[PDB]
Amino acid sequence: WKGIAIALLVILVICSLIVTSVILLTPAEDNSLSQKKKVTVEDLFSEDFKI
Amino acid sequence: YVTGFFIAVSVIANVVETVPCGSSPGHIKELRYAVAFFCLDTACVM
């Protein structure tokens, strides 16, 4: 009565691996912070922007 | 027994989806709030 439980364990772990795969697959997130300071008032008169 | 385990994991997801470490912000500025529970939820619901 234990081997049937082993088959149940293997089918449930197959299902769980499917769940983990879809968890890593469907939400293909990407933050891409690109944290650079916004242009301030003095920037137009900063020497860097002095064309 | 397998549908019992599915019910159990569904209920565990239901209870854990509110703790401020897996489905609520425990980090105000860091990067988790995975909506994967939804997927898991769907994985159960179907």
From Swiss-Prot, chain A:
Record-given protein name: A-type potassium channel modulatory protein DPP6
Family to which this protein belongs: Belongs to the peptidase S9B family.
Subcellular location per the Swiss-Prot or TrEMBL entry: Cell membrane
Subunit field text: Homodimer (in vitro). Interacts with KCND2. Identified in a complex with KCND2 and KCNIP2. Forms an octameric complex composed of four DPP6 subunits bound to the KCND2 tetramer. Interacts with KCND3; this interaction modulates the channel gating kinetics namely channel activation and inactivation kinetics and rate of recovery from inactivation.
Transmembrane annotation, as ranges: 4-24
Disease field: Familial paroxysmal ventricular fibrillation 2: A cardiac arrhythmia marked by fibrillary contractions of the ventricular muscle due to rapid repetitive excitation of myocardial fibers without coordinated contraction of the ventricle and by absence of atrial activity. Intellectual developmental disorder, autosomal dominant 33: A disorder characterized by significantly below average general intellectual functioning associated with impairments in adaptive behavior and manifested during the developmental period. MRD33 patients manifest microcephaly in addition to intellectual disability.
Post-translational changes noted in the entry: N-glycosylated.
Gene designation per UniProt: DPP6
Swiss-Prot record, chain B:
PTM (free text): Phosphorylated by MAPK in response to signaling via the metabotropic glutamate receptor GRM5.
Tissue and organ expression note: Detected in ovary, in corpus luteum and in granulosa and theca cells in the follicle (at protein level). Highly expressed throughout the brain. Detected in amygdala, caudate nucleus, cerebellum, hippocampus, substantia nigra and thalamus. Expression is not detectable or very low in heart, kidney, liver, lung, pancreas and skeletal muscle. Not detectable in human heart atrium.
Cysteine pairs bridged by disulfides in the record: none
Extracellular side: 19-34
TM ranges: 1-18
Protein origin, superkingdom: Eukaryota
Cell compartment(s), UniProt: Cell membrane; Cell projection, Dendrite; Synapse; Perikaryon
Extra remark beyond the main annotation: The transient neuronal A-type potassium current called I(SA) is triggered at membrane potentials that are below the threshold for action potentials. It inactivates rapidly and recovers rapidly from inactivation. It regulates the firing of action potentials and plays a role in synaptic integration and plasticity. Potassium channels containing KCND2 account for about 80% of the neuronal A-type potassium current. In contrast, the potassium channel responsible for the cardiac I(to) current differs between species; it is mediated by KCND2 in rodents. Is specifically and reversibly inhibited by the scorpion toxin Ts8 (AC P69940).
Disease link: KNCD2 mutations have been found in a family with autism and epilepsy and may play a role in disease pathogenesis. Autism is a complex multifactorial, pervasive developmental disorder characterized by impairments in reciprocal social interaction and communication, restricted and stereotyped patterns of interests and activities, and the presence of developmental abnormalities by 3 years of age. A KCND2 mutation leading to the production of a C-terminally truncated protein has been identified in a patient with epilepsy. Epilepsy is characterized by paroxysmal transient disturbances of the electrical activity of the brain that may be manifested as episodic impairment or loss of consciousness, abnormal motor phenomena, psychic or sensory disturbances, or perturbation of the autonomic nervous system.
Task performed by this protein: Voltage-gated potassium channel that mediates transmembrane potassium transport in excitable membranes, primarily in the brain. Mediates the major part of the dendritic A-type current I(SA) in brain neurons. This current is activated at membrane potentials that are below the threshold for action potentials.
Similarity-based family: Belongs to the potassium channel family. D (Shal) (TC 1.A.1.2) subfamily. Kv4.2/KCND2 sub-subfamily.
Name the record gives this protein: A-type voltage-gated potassium channel KCND2
Organism encoding this protein: Homo sapiens
